[PDB]
Amino acid sequence: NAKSVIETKNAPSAIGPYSQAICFNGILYASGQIPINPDTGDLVENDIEKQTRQVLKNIDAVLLQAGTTKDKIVKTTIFITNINNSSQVNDIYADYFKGTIFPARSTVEVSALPKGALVEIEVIAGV
Amino acid sequence: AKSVIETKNAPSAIGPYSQAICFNGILYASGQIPINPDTGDLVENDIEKQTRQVLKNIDAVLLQAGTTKDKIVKTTIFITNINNSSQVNDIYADYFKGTIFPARSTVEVSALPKGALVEIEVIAGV
Amino acid sequence: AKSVIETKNAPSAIGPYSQAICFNGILYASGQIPINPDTGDLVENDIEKQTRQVLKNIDAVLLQAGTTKDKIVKTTIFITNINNSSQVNDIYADYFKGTIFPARSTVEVSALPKGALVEIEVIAGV
Ligand SMILES: [Ca+2]
Ligand SMILES: [Ca+2]
Ligand SMILES: [Ca+2]
């Protein structure tokens, strides 16, 4: 249960002094994921739907490397640069979480995100 | 395993989220905005009225989970106007009077769901 | 079971909040802004001085709680200018040298308490 690191080449390499996720006392604390394609290191196109899809795939990669799944996510925070993009984010986020007990959640409009991203999603999960 | 909290005394979750999730003895509440649960609409565009509603909604979630506000360990206050901090704080202080005050973070954001002026997220012991 | 952390070497908790709460083996720290506890006033608008003051304040909380920065699992960095990310990162990296870096999220918010450039919230094992 002591603090352990999660590292996978299937999620973006850390672009700063942080770990992709930390497991501790049965909780996986994921870094906020932005819409970087892990294979190229580039932000995907300036399109909220494509970016939401990329973020959720990056989160999934972190969960898999930790040996857990999206069904175990307890709580998320959505940081978006335009509150009017909430519905398009929700429409895809729901697809990802369909059939699970939906996590608790907060959504707020931020003024800017790393690399000019439109959305960043942070999750905590059970291990 | 995680378990859901659902009560008609708190605003219906529209987006693909649960009002709160309990896991390993901790209640993770969704951020509450100043919705009247009976209508789904925000209350008046007044920071004091909205803060009061948020806290009522939080109370309803805690009660359904079988816990209380004195078990809250940490909150985050998201407000659209940092100049409203004093008014939010005084109502928040009255809500927590007589308890060990939670840890807290406060930030100003440029917008909130439904055009709310305030959104408060809490974590509690169950 | 929840317990308060209080130290005169972090900014006085004016009003309804605790500097940090410990519960079930986790330290939930309040977000720290660059108030100098020696003066009670905010540090000048130099992102490096403010980031160092924030980390000094976090250090004081960890010390009083009987834990260390090696046990931090997650931080959130709220900044008023995303262009300050690099300067914050370099200081934050020196701070965490020799530890497994925490999980993290960094976002630019519309404003912070007292007009601060940076607020950092941490979660740690006790
Ligand atoms: Ca859909
Ligand atoms: Ca200790
Ligand atoms: Ca900016």
The alpha carbon of residue C94 is apart from the nearest alpha carbon of chain B, in Å, by 24
Query: Is B121 at the interface with chain A, CB within 8 A?
Result: yes
**For residue C12, what is the domain's CATH number?**
3.30.1330.40
One-letter amino acid at B22 equals C
Residues with CB under 5 A from ligand 3 (ion): A 112
A78 touches A89 (CB < 8 A): yes
Cβ A5–C123 below 8 Å, yes or no? no
C5: Cα within 13 Å, side-chain hemisphere: 29
Q: Could you say which DSSP state residue C84 is in?
A: G
- Tokens, residue C74: 């997650």
> Which alpha helices (DSSP H) does chain C contain, by range?
47-64, 85-96
Among candidate residues B21, B28, B43, the one with its CA nearest the CA of residue B121: B28
Please check whether residue C79 is in contact with residue C116, taking contact to mean a CB–CB distance below 8 angstroms: no
CB C28 within 8 A of CB B103: yes
Parent domain of C124: 1-126
Q: Where are the alpha helices (DSSP H) in A9-73?
A: 48-65
Q: Which helix (H) or strand (E) holds B93?
A: helix B85-96
Cβ contact, residue pair C105, A79, below 8 Å: yes
* Neighbours, chain B (3 or more CB pairs < 8 A): A, C
The method recorded for this entry reads: X-ray
Tally of domains within chain C: 1
Contact B103/C16, CB-based, under 8 Å? Answer: no
C3-5 and C20-23 beta bridge pairing: antiparallel
Cα angle for residues C41, C49, B73 (degrees, 5° grid): 65
Q: Which DSSP helix (H) or strand (E) runs through A79?
A: strand A73-80
Nearest to B117 by CA among B91, B88, B74: B88
Centre of ligand 3 from the C-alpha of residue B75, in Å: 25
- Neighbours of A, requiring at least 3 CB pairs below 8 Å, are B, C
Residue C87, token pair as written in the block:
């300067």
Q: Report CA-CA distances (Å) from B104 to A17, B66, B95, B98, C111.
A: 25, 23, 14, 17, 16
Resolution in Å, one decimal, please. Answer: 1.6
Q: In whole angstroms, how far apart are CA C103 and each of A6, A33, A113, B125, C70?
A: 10, 11, 16, 23, 12
